C-alpha cells in the first residue's frame, strides 16, 4: 500500500540516552532533570 | 552483607505514559513535546 505510514523511529536512541544520563549523574529528582535534558536538546542543532 | 548495584523503579512507568501520549498526539517534533510534558508535570507537584 502506498499510503500507510505512522511510526517514525528516533525515540529509541533518544530514550536510551536518558537512561545513561540519569544513571550517570543519578539526580535526586528525575522530573526536573527530565525538563533539563530535553530542553537543552533543542539547542543541540535544530 | 551481600552488596551489589540495582536500578530504581519508576523510570519505565514514566516513559510508558509519555510513549502513549506521543502516539495519541502524534506531534511533529518529540523534542519540544518532551519538554512540554515533563515541564508541565512540575505544575502537579504543588
Amino acid at each position: 500500500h502506498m499510503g500507510h505510514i505512522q511510526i517514525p523511529p528516533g525515540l529509541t536512541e533518544l530514550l536510551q540516552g536518558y537512561t545513561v544520563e540519569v544513571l550517570r549523574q543519578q539526580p535526586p529528582d528525575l522530573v526536573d532533570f527530565a525538563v533539563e535534558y530535553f530542553t537543552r536538546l533543542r539547542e543541540a542543532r535544530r | 552483607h551481600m552488596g551489589h548495584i540495582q536500578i530504581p523503579p519508576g523510570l519505565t512507568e514514566l516513559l510508558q505514559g509519555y510513549t502513549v501520549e506521543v502516539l495519541r498526539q502524534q506531534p511533529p517534533d518529540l523534542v519540544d513535546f518532551a519538554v512540554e510534558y515533563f515541564t508541565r508535570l512540575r505544575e502537579a507537584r504543588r
Binding site: 525515540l11 529509541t12 530514550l15 536510551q16 537512561t19 545513561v20 | 516513559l15 510508558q16 510513549t19 502516539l23
Partner: peptide, 24 residues
C-alpha cells in the same frame, strides 16, 4: 557497565509499542 544492559531492555519495551502501533 550494567546500565547498558538495563537501559537496553527498558528501550525494547517502549519500541515494542511505537513500532507495533503501525501494523496490528
Amino acid at each position: 557497565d550494567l546500565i547498558e544492559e538495563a537501559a537496553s531492555r527498558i528501550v525494547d519495551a517502549v519500541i515494542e509499542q511505537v513500532k507495533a502501533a503501525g501494523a496490528y
